[PDB]
């Protein structure tokens, strides 16, 4: 099988690699929602999964945040459970060990909490053994 | 793109992955969308608060599934009492605040607590009862356990591993409604606080009531000296009545104790050292009756000999077997020429735990290593014949998979010997336990080591630990120390400190367990020229402030004669010096004056006095803990800004 | 209930018209009577409480001005007794707490029907003619240690001095529980005890007193019992038991408890 | 349209109050204040029942006051009063929660009844927050509303004891019989289940003969020396063990039984023991476990117990009424001859 990116680029896909994606397996096969580098980053993972693992996976995670968001969007659209849950876990790793301000700063997050609301949420949180 | 532009479903998926509760609380303060997501996503909650202000309970945790009420302050307090009529309202309050609860752990101080809280969730699936206090007097046996049977109840797992009760309560409760017992798929009775293990007849009745059990753990009495002790008939009844069993854990009550003087046959004044009513033929029949068995643990305080044939039958009749734990089973490995035998034929084992094996030699260890080539965790206790050569070679054989090793009470294998023995797997081991024995006669980077457990006799120092070989542990993060012994017979230390400053050698250390609770000494009155427990607490805790600890579990030493585990002045003073502490649990008692020392710690959030030992102080009159002291301390801690 | 009942952890047990009040010694709390209480609850109304210096009480309620003298403790005891409608009580006290009860009886005789004392002493510092306590120098060491502990806690360093670091081996047993309190409160109570002396007031006590001492006690001389019998203003009896330690009612219950129960149940003195 | 006529009424009155002040949106604070009105409603009774401090009548009106100030804190909207303000998102949340709570309570099978609605709007964070400053806790009143809604051997030992204590032949034969039969299983049973512990009461005036008797019985059946515990006015230089430290007589008994589950225990002068010790022995004989001074329970095992009595086979006429229960519940009672 040969797939087509949104930009129009074409990539060659193995049959087992195609069966990795439920969306692709159920459905030229143009992909008008994903770009070329998305396949260039997902196909090696698909092939490795079809056929050391921890180090290689950690190396493959070594990508910038925005590229990672495009990846998880692509995993959702292609509906690949393993890729999507690994990606979401990888992002949630930067959630841990950070204060709310740090999350906002690393994530260009805008704060809409009034001091009273923040105090109330802290009061609710005080009921859970961390 | 930013995350708020992502679809919400993968937000729920991505944010169900942060299990660290501190991180979850931090995430709840990001924004309104994130807060709503976290509150709809949190599944496990361990309730933190006081009984008085339980009507200030938040209702934001509507989607939780597992709820833990055993840590409600004051610890062990009766959550519901029959003396107060408005205690009926607590059931409704909990039911409404957590409507989607399937797994529950509650402190069952009183029967009314059970009868009011447990039947609230008809969909309750797993129950864990905790009670370290006295068993209240009831009209018959199992009256407080009968309260679990609800009309619309479908309880599936029952946990009594910490719920102190009479062993006669279990069979009486299980015989009162056959539907309730038949619905049970798991049953944990491995409670070390039982005065005596279950009888033979009680085990028979328990297993007859519950034919669908998938996991069964029990604290049985295997001493032949007693009447009705569990023997062959009990085990064959287990095999016949529960053919679906996947986990079977029978251990004698003494084998479960925290103190080594209770189960060690060497340390008991002639106790044990006599055969149980367990034959090789009976074990063969038992294993033949459990084709689905996956985890086996037979930890007896009485010897079973020539068990090699039974362990061989284990390999053929239990293909799914993965973990075996054997206590005082002898002849488990008796190699002749080169043919593997006994436990060495169980190639499918992943973790092996053996204890007090007289027959075991170096060849036995070599056979275990060569046969059980899939072994990932190995625990050996109290084998007097094995040496460094055998253990080192067994490590080298299993060097591909062995990541967890425990070497305790081995006469010929000291601390230095154990560390030299673990050299072939030095760069792979993750969890490690040794005895700090410096008196045993006869490239070095622990790259993956993450957890170290130590056992050391009272009055000994910890400084030689670095010279012992445990020098460079870049990834070491949690260390647990257990100190056992009787210091009433011991003189004053000639060295001022135990040496917790030696633990500065490991830069990533942030968690601690200092279990001194099994030291016996003099609490407030020493007879004459003796040294009280405050001196030993000072000796052990000095320099604990230098370590950058963030969590600390402390077990104060006890005075068995008067039954008290008080925190002394030097102990509180030193624990106050730990500025970085985030959680601080003390498994004992401390009055208000010492408890208020801890408000100096700025980063401190979780503090509790947990008397999780038998018997817990029955009331405020009998100990130096008061409910008002607890409430005042908690209010002062929360108000700190 | 009441503020006084919450500030002193007062508990009422047992039944019957006669009330027994158990006053613990300094440095401990009402938990020290957990071995005696079961023997009394059947046929007595036992009143247990913690005086304001005890570690189980709120350190904020402690008034350094009021409790720099024993009169504060006697007034607190009178307030506790009057609040719980206790009259003609039987008081069992340990060292230096029975002294406070005796002063309270001086002020309010109607409250106390008898006094049972466990190793009491009117004045703790012995003079040249008075051998009824310890030498001033041997207690100066304990005062120094308590002051140093308080100084250490002020700076945020752990207090690292105990009664086991003294040299008397009798100060070790006597002062062991004095370090079981917040260091400033410990200093205040210790200075009060050092300055305490009830020798002039011994003639104003009219309630019977049942002095109980240890055989050949190294800590408080046995002659103090005879001294009090000679100076007490009311009926008095002295019994000696072959016990030892600062807390015989806890460490040696099988010997101390029969003696205390007998002295409680017999009035003739 | 998914509400009861009364709930529809109270919602539209909340709406009318919203349209009279033009404050933008119909927040659930308004509907809660509506519930405060119409005194026939259940919220007043629930509030007075929930808090003891709420029994004061004007505190309920103080609740109205604190709702009112929060409403006054709401900026107005530039719109005609002849319109329905948009009910806030919290109100759809509360209504949906009401629907769900109604659904779950009758799993067998929607028009929402008044009490589910009021629970739902107490669940609103703003309503609870406002109530908290007014000394009112929404969970307490909520639970109150929900609760209101519910409205051979014989001779082989006989020869030896007859050798030792030949002046007590008849009592020796009787005790031989009883000990042999309880050991063989022909003795009293702790209910339907059998028991191993044996409980013997040894009356009579011969003390030294009784002591040598129990010594012989111990050395024969168990081959061990007896254990010297006294309870009465019989203390000497052996029982007065200060080495035990914080142990009373009951503590000594419990520790000895725990450490030696296979021996004979003789208790001296059960008649002169304290009422506490006798009560503890009664509890041990009923429940089969001895409790010591710290509340710990210790299994009796099967220890041979003998109580050395002195009242004058044991006749019931010679037993004081206080000890009658012990004799009735003891396994056997043996009277030594003078």
From Swiss-Prot, chain A:
Pathway: Protein modification; protein ubiquitination. Residues 72-130 are annotated as: Interaction with the F-box domain of F-box proteins. SMART domains: Skp1 (SM00512). It holds the Pfam family Skp1_POZ. Signal peptide: none annotated. Disulfide bonds: none annotated. InterPro entries: SKP1 (IPR016897), SKP1-like (IPR001232), SKP1-like_dim_sf (IPR036296), SKP1/BTB/POZ_sf (IPR011333), Skp1_comp_dimer (IPR016072), Skp1_comp_POZ (IPR016073). GO terms for biological process: auxin-activated signaling pathway; chromosome segregation; ethylene-activated signaling pathway; jasmonic acid mediated signaling pathway; microtubule cytoskeleton organization; negative regulation of DNA recombination; protein ubiquitination; response to auxin. Accumulates only in meristematic cells. Expressed in inflorescence, shoot and root apical meristems, as well as in developing organs such as gametocytes and seeds. Also detected in cortical layer and epidermis of roots, leaves, pith and vascular bundle of young stem, young floral buds and organ primordia, pollen and through the valve of siliques. Not detectable in mature root tissues. Keywords: Auxin signaling pathway, Chromosome partition, Cytoplasm, Cytoskeleton, Developmental protein, Ethylene signaling pathway, Host-virus interaction, Nucleus, Ubl conjugation pathway. It is found in: Nucleus; Cytoplasm, Cytoskeleton, Spindle; Cytoplasm, Cytoskeleton, Phragmoplast. GO terms for cellular component: cytosol; mitochondrion; nucleus; phragmoplast; SCF ubiquitin ligase complex; spindle. Belongs to the SKP1 family. Part of a SCF E3 ubiquitin ligase complex composed of SKP1, CUL1, RBX1 (RBX1A or RBX1B) and F-box proteins. Involved in ubiquitination and subsequent proteasomal degradation of target proteins. Together with CUL1, RBX1 and a F-box protein, it forms a SCF E3 ubiquitin ligase complex. The functional specificity of this complex depends on the type of F-box protein. In the SCF complex, it serves as an adapter that links the F-box protein to CUL1. SCF(UFO) is required for vegetative and floral organ development as well as for male gametogenesis. SCF(TIR1) is involved in auxin signaling pathway. SCF(COI1) regulates responses to jasmonates. This is SKP1-like protein 1A. It comes from Arabidopsis thaliana.
UniProtKB/Swiss-Prot annotation, chain D:
Disruption phenotype: Low seed dormancy and short hypocotyls. Suppresses max2 phenotypes associated with karrikin-KAI2-regulated growth. Smax1 and smxl2 double mutants have substantial reduction in hypocotyl elongation. Probable component of a transcriptional corepressor complex that acts downstream of MAX2 to negatively regulate karrikins/strigolactone responses. Probable target of MAX2 during germination and seedling photomorphogenesis. Acts probably specifically in the karrikin pathway. Gene3D superfamilies: Clp, N-terminal domain (1.10.1780.10), P-loop containing nucleotide triphosphate hydrolases (3.40.50.300). Induction: Up-regulated by karrikins treatments. Under MAX2-dependent negative feedback regulation. This is Protein SUPPRESSOR OF MAX2 1. Belongs to the ClpA/ClpB family. It holds the Pfam family AAA_2. Interacts probably with TPL/TPR in an EAR-motif dependent manner. Interacts with TPL, TPR1, TPR2 and TPR4. Residues 1-151 form the Clp R domain. Residues 87-151 are annotated as: Repeat 2. Highly expressed in dry seeds. Expressed in seedlings, rosette leaves and senescing leaves. Detected in roots and axillary shoots. Expressed in the primary rosette buds and expanding leaves of adult rosettes, the vasculature of the hypocotyls, cotyledons, and mature roots, in the midvein and petioles of young leaves, the young leaf periphery, stomata, and the root caps. Contains 1 EAR motif required for the interaction with TPR2. Residues 3-74 are annotated as: Repeat 1.
